Write a protein that binds this ligand. Structure first.
Ligand SMILES: O=S(=O)(O)OC[C@H]1O[C@@](COS(=O)(=O)O)(O[C@H]2O[C@H](COS(=O)(=O)O)[C@@H](OS(=O)(=O)O)[C@H](OS(=O)(=O)O)[C@H]2OS(=O)(=O)O)[C@@H](OS(=O)(=O)O)[C@@H]1OS(=O)(=O)O
Ligand SMILES: *[C@H]1O[C@H](CO)[C@@H](O)[C@H](O)[C@@H]1O
Ligand SMILES: *[C@H]1O[C@H](CO)[C@@H](O)[C@H](O)[C@@H]1O
Ligand SMILES: *[C@H]1O[C@H](CO)[C@@H](O)[C@H](O)[C@@H]1O
Ligand SMILES: *[C@H]1O[C@H](CO)[C@@H](O)[C@H](O)[C@@H]1O
Lengths: 96, 101
């Protein structure tokens, strides 16, 4: 019974923000070797970048002068497709 | 050589999307026990929830009737503090073909 050399680290689960890498070795000719077949380490500890997506422009409205508004969504993510902007919601009221 | 009882799984590394929990044990009266002092299992494999944050309302503007608009930001995250709404950006501006034969 002998322990083989440690294998290469696997792929990190997360590209950023914290992931785990696993390294494996094989015990030969026995089910009970002294040591461990699997080790785990931290990987990709760099903070995820901040993705910014701008909302569609508000319809032009009078203040003559006209103005329109927009907002930005900010999120710390690895995939830009995970951040999305929802539908435009409009609220109305009457003033006399 | 003797293995102690398994310890608690401790805290999962990730709150959602996949994490690992580790439980530890101690080898007694020996430096070479058959087995491992630590075991790892999967935890919190459920996909992360979609967090929604609404933007501040635009100032009321006439169409009398008044109307205002707002948007919502949706993101798959574990911490709501990681999702934020940015600053309000405003664009401003000021406000016939005669055919004489
Ligand atoms: O030096 S500062 O005090 O200005 O800080 C700059 C960093 O602040 C953020 C996030 O705010 S914080 O969490 O309070 O730190 O953003 C804000 O400032 C930038 C403008 O920087 S500038 O040098 O004055 O040009 C704005 O970017 S921009 O859209 O105007 O182009 C941010 O506007 S936005 O809402 O993100 O669209 C503004 O955000 S906020 O109104 O305070 O919430 C960091 O931006 S972040 O990385 O997107 O969060 C700035 O860091 S950076 O490296 O300078 O971009
Ligand atoms: C494997 O583990 C260590 C060496 O890495 C020793 O306890 C022994 O060689 C075992 O087979
Ligand atoms: C792997 O771990 C270390 C090297 O990183 C040594 O104890 C030995 O090479 C083992 O196979
Ligand atoms: C501990 O691991 C197992 C028992 O859980 C055996 O290989 C042996 O008792 C070892 O000390
Ligand atoms: C470890 O595994 C379980 C507890 O997690 C039990 O079979 C026993 O305590 C063992 O040592």
């Amino acid at each position: 019974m002998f322990w083989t050399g440690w294998g290469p680290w696997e792929r990190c689960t997360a590209q950023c923000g914290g992931g785990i890498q696993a390294r494996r070795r094989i015990c030969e000719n026995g089910p009970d070797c002294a040591g461990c077949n699997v080790e785990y380490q931290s990987c990709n500890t760099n903070p995820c970048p901040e993705l910014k997506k701008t909302t569609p422009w508000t319809p032009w409205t009078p203040v003559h002068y006209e103005q329109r508004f927009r907002y930005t969504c900010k999120a710390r993510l690895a995939d830009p497709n995970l951040l999305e902007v929802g539908r435009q919601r409009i609220e109305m009221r009457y003033c006399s």
